[PDB]
Amino acid sequence: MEKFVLSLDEGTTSARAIIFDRESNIHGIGQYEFPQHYPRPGWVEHNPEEIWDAQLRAIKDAIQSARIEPNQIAAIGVTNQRETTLVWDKDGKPLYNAIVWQCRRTAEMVEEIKREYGTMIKEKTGLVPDAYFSASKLKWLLDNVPGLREKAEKGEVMFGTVDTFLIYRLTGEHVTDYSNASRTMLFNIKKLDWDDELLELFDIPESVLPEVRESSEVYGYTKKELLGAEIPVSGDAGDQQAALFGQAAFEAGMVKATYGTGSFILVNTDKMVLYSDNLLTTIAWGLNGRVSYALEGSIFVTGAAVQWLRDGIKIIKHASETEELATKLESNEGVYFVPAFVGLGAPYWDQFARGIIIGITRGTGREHLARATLEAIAYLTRDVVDEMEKLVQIKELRVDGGATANDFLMQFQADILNRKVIRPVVKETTALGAAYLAGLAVDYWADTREIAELWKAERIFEPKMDEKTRERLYKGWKEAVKRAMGWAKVVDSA
Amino acid sequence: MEKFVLSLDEGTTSARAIIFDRESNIHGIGQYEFPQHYPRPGWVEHNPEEIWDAQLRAIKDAIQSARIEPNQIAAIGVTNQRETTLVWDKDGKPLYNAIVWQCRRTAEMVEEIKREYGTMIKEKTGLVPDAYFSASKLKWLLDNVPGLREKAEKGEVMFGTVDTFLIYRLTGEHVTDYSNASRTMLFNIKKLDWDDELLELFDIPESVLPEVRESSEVYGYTKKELLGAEIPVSGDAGDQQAALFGQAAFEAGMVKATYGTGSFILVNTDKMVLYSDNLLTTIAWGLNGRVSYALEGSIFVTGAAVQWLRDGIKIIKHASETEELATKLESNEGVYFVPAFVGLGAPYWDQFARGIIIGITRGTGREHLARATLEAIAYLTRDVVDEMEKLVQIKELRVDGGATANDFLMQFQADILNRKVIRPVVKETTALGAAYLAGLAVDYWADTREIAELWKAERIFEPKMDEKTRERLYKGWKEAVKRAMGWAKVVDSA
């Protein structure tokens, strides 16, 4: 009887489940949104019970839609939004909301630390000190949740990133993989272990920490009842590395970009550890006793600028609408939108940037905003790829996320880059990457030589814009960006 | 029989006629929009026959609804939009479209002249060289309209602002008053005559020029055909100065702001000629052999940023809705909209500034844009008033235009200025000033002293905002303005 891999993609706004076959075809999808909690300006929280309930409901639909029995699921892969920090008790009940990777409550605290400790943290961690990472968020939780520092000091608090939470709830194990752990700013990526000086700096009791494992490994087994069969949980990577793995990006020098709420661009650097003042050195995955590294640019707001057109000012009914508006014009006509809704990530790392639409005139319409938002998404990607090029060659880009279906966005992307932008036949690249990691671990697949042969270019966009136009459109953007900078640090009237 | 004054208000978008009595109650209005020609972005023109068509229909409408015979009209006053340049032949046929005050076609050519001649032009004219003014709109026509230059060196082209145009058609006289001529950037406001060095500098045959007369003076009579009587044309001034005169601002130190498409604030400086590097010294009016001067700040886009909300990104149906939207929030929450659609007027004079919305976050909605737009109209006013305060006390603002019906806007205006903002009973203050000007010429009113008692206050908005808050709101606005500067001279397109 035919078996399949189940994969959880617990994203920032939606918890999803995709059942895959050994050719990497999809057989079932469940997806459910759960609420975003904005308790204060620039504070973002998710409720961990709503995550789970959405994540469960999603598994059942994928199963149902695929019409397999539970017994036909060989392995569960887990993947997740990365920096969102949870804490829960032995019976597994949250001691607060998750502080999301998007949340900035720690910005002033990290700004001070960065000054005196920036280089030390970067050398241990690969990371640029920022509110984005777990470390400062655990600290804030420990100092602000009434009686959790004391409970954690009693060895009664479990910390995790989202993969950890989901694996706990599924198997009762307290673990994370190297990739999600590289993201906490507490984990030493050269030594591959929790870092003592860092636990001190942030005042972290160690009892709180999960055990760090590889990215492909049986971590545990599901109660038969949750799902009806007892299934191995065997794959675990942060979502943006799982999309790297989902893209078959298995050799050093291979680059993907995923477009969602934000956009994240990873080059696989393999056994090599590469340094960049303005990008992230991160772990890709741990597989077969070996560790792959990666270089990342993390761009916090890309598709969220399209959500904002639909939901904030409501100039559109759907994201789909953005493309036909945009293509109503033959250029941006001097209109630019730097959507720095809360600061800029890579490579500017300005916690104070805010968003700006500049170049407005009497004729600025819905079409110019649609276009400026789409092009922003392409400029932000280049800001990162150009910084990667200060040290390493970036040939071409493999891409994924809903936005990749927008052909205007995709052609504008290859055009301002002067690089091929390639979308594959599989869509759920993030899900498929956690599936491959799990499948590998119970022999559902034999090796990555095998898996590599499963990957296919659906379409390849080729650059066809000339230098003068590239350079002039990008020079507008660069100038637009300067104007977004520092804004939350002159104003508040906020 | 009972007798009335009819005044023409030939606005930027609309042609209007109002019939008034000695008490200044309005017995009848006509009003008609006419077409805005934007042949090329940044270019604005009017068709003079459409302006005439609309003006004459409004006259006949006003007379209609007053239910008077034309012999009941003691005098006509004429006010107009102010810098718009017409040219026409001896039979009175436009030799070209009107180049509106809005039109930026000459920006670069003026930009150039500003380095050799800014001090000499300001000295003569009170004006900051800007494409705003007549001079260069007249060079353009002379230089680019085929055969117009040669026809003019032969004496067959008449130039005029819209007052001159209209009086020519009503009367066959070719005249302007002091206020309109001061706007040409071709008239010496100190000597009170056309100026030879500017005529030379702008390459302008003197045969083009009308005779400069006072603002309350019988110019000519209307043809008995036209309107059925032989009616004296006896008032003429620029619209913005006539609003000054209909606000009864006869004493030096009295100040008004009119709100329309753009905004203009004038203080009556009386018999003094005041200098300011960043505002316009102009002529208020010529009356009984005396000339009153003024200090002005001109702001190109204010109400137009509201039209953009409605016609550009279409986030409101009716300009009405903006108050209701703005008042849904308690502050702008760090959101500013510098609507410098066409560059900035006084005190900045940056022809390259473009519109910027800054401080955009995921929770920025239609209400933040509505509120940001309203507050911009009050901020732009304060930029000018503060620039005037560097020379002269500005005590309070008498205020007119349709936006003065907006209480959030009016109260916010008193608020950031910390000054009273006083809205009179008689709404149609522009037409009113030309009515008083024409009527004084013909003894329909004895005195500006008699007329002064006709003015009564309908509502005085009084400040009630703390220094700390007024200062913070405004510090944000200035930082936003800085970020609007100079955009167009780096983005340049298509």
Query: What tokens does B316 get?
Result: 């409101």
Beta strands in B202-243, from DSSP E residues, in sequence order: 211-213, 216-221, 232-238
Q: How far apart are CA B322 and CA B302, in angstroms?
A: 13
Place of tokens 């459109």: A473
Q: How far apart are CA A285 and CA A287, in angstroms?
A: 6
Alpha-carbon radius of gyration of chain B: 22
On the 0-12 / 13-18 / 19+ scale of CB atoms within 10 A, B446 is exposed
B334 vs A314, A358, A494: nearest CB: A494
Cβ distance B315 to A312 less than 8 Å, yes or no, reads no
Domains defined along chain B, listed by start: 1-247 (3.30.420.40), 248-494 (3.30.420.40)
Query: Who contacts B206 (Cβ-Cβ below 8 Å, separation ≥6)?
Result: B194, B199
Answer yes or no: is B14 a known binding residue: yes
The DSSP secondary structure of A90-124, one letter per residue, reads TT--BSS-EE-TT--TTHHHHHHHHHHHHHHHHHH
Q: Which of B75, B435, B483, B449 is CA-nearest to residue B246?
A: B435
Q: Which of B258, B245, B154, B248 is CA-nearest to residue B205?
A: B154
Q: Which of B185, B182, B195 is CA-nearest to residue B139?
A: B185
Query: Who contacts B304 (Cβ-Cβ below 8 Å, separation ≥6)?
Result: A362, B261, B262, B339, B341
HSE-CB at B108 with a 13 A cutoff on CA atoms is 4
Q: Which of B135, B136, B83, B66 is CA-nearest to residue B106?
A: B136
Residues of chain A in contact with residue B360, where contact means CB-CB under 8 angstroms, are 308, 339, 341, 354-357
* Alpha-carbon distance A109 to nearest alpha carbon in chain B (angstroms): 22
Cβ distance A492 to B334 less than 8 Å, yes or no, reads yes
Query: What element of type H or E holds B279?
Result: none
Window 456-485 of B, Cβ < 8 Å to A? 472-473, 475-476, 479-480, 483-484
Q: How was this structure determined?
A: X-ray
Q: How far apart are CA A277 and CA B312, in angstroms?
A: 42
Helix-then-strand count for chain B, H and E: 17, 23
Are A330 and B494 in contact by the 8 Å Cβ rule? The answer is: yes
Query: What tokens does B159 get?
Result: 């130039």
Residue type (1 letter), B190: K
Are B65 and B28 in contact by the 8 Å Cβ rule? The answer is: yes
Residues of chain B in contact with residue A306, where contact means CB-CB under 8 angstroms, are none
Q: How far apart are CA B295 and CA A90, in angstroms?
A: 76
Query: What tokens does A184 get?
Result: 């906490």
Angle between helices A239-246 and A429-441 (to 10 degrees): 80
Angle between helices A162-171 and A48-66 (to 10 degrees): 70
Which of B325, B338, B360 is most worth mutating to test chain A (most A CB atoms within 10 A of its CB)?
B360
Beta strands in A58-99, from DSSP E residues, in sequence order: 73-80, 85-88, 98-99
* Alpha-carbon distance A101 to nearest alpha carbon in chain B (angstroms): 15
Coil, strand or helix at B359: strand
Query: What tokens does A251 get?
Result: 């050799």
Are B256 and B243 in contact by the 8 Å Cβ rule? The answer is: yes
Query: What tokens does A471 get?
Result: 């350079």
Bridge-based pairing state of the strands B14-20 and B98-99: unpaired
End-to-end CA distance of chain B: 63
Q: How far apart are CA A252 and CA A254, in angstroms?
A: 5
Q: How far apart are CA A11 and CA A31, in angstroms?
A: 10
The alpha carbon of B466 is separated from its chain's Cα centroid by a whole number of angstroms, namely 33
Largest separation between any pair of C-alpha atoms in chain A: 66
Q: Which of A191, A208, A212 is CA-nearest to residue A199?
A: A208
Answer yes or no: is B402 a known binding residue: yes
Are B105 and B99 in contact by the 8 Å Cβ rule? The answer is: yes
Answer yes or no: is B216 a known binding residue: no
Output DSSP code: residue A403. Answer: G
3-state helix, strand, coil in chain A (%, to 5): 35, 25, 40
Window 299-338 of B, Cβ < 8 Å to A? 304, 308, 312-315, 331-334, 336-337
Residues of chain B in contact with residue A356, where contact means CB-CB under 8 angstroms, are 356-360, 483
The DSSP secondary structure of A146-159, one letter per residue, reads TTHHHHHHTT--EE
Residue type (1 letter), A464: K
Sign of torsion over alpha carbons B116, B122, B128, B130? negative
Q: How far apart are CA B142 and CA B154, in angstroms?
A: 13
Sign of torsion over alpha carbons B352, B358, B362, B363? negative
Query: What element of type H or E holds A235?
Result: strand A232-238
Angle between helices A407-417 and A366-389 (to 10 degrees): 40
Q: Is A208 left (phi over 0), alpha (psi -120 to 50) or beta?
A: alpha
Q: How far apart are CA B201 and CA B198, in angstroms?
A: 5
State how far the alpha carbon of A338 is from the alpha carbons of A108, A228, A354, A483, B236, in Å: 23, 49, 8, 9, 49
Cis? peptide before A41, omega within 30° of 0? no
Are A420 and A463 in contact by the 8 Å Cβ rule? The answer is: yes
Query: What tokens does B457 get?
Result: 């206050």
Enumerate long-range contacts of B139-143, CB under 8 Å, 24 or more apart: B139/B106, B139/B109, B139/B202, B139/B203, B139/B204, B140/B99, B140/B105, B140/B106, B141/B85, B141/B87, B141/B95, B141/B96, B141/B99, B142/B203, B142/B204, B142/B205, B143/B203
Instruction: For A363, name the nearest residue in chain B, comparing CA atoms only.
Output: B312
Q: How far apart are CA A259 and CA A209, in angstroms?
A: 31
* Alpha-carbon distance A133 to nearest alpha carbon in chain B (angstroms): 21
Query: What element of type H or E holds B12?
Result: none
Place of tokens 């617990």: A10
Q: Which of B377, B361, B368, B261 is CA-nearest to residue B313?
A: B368
B341 vs A314, A361, A484: nearest CB: A361
Backbone angles phi, psi at A466, to 5 degrees: -80, 155
Q: How far apart are CA A108 and CA A130, in angstroms?
A: 10
Q: Which of B81, B191, B190, B207 is CA-nearest to residue B134?
A: B81
Cis? peptide before A347, omega within 30° of 0? yes
Cβ distance B308 to A360 less than 8 Å, yes or no, reads yes
Q: How far apart are CA B150 and CA A425, in angstroms?
A: 70
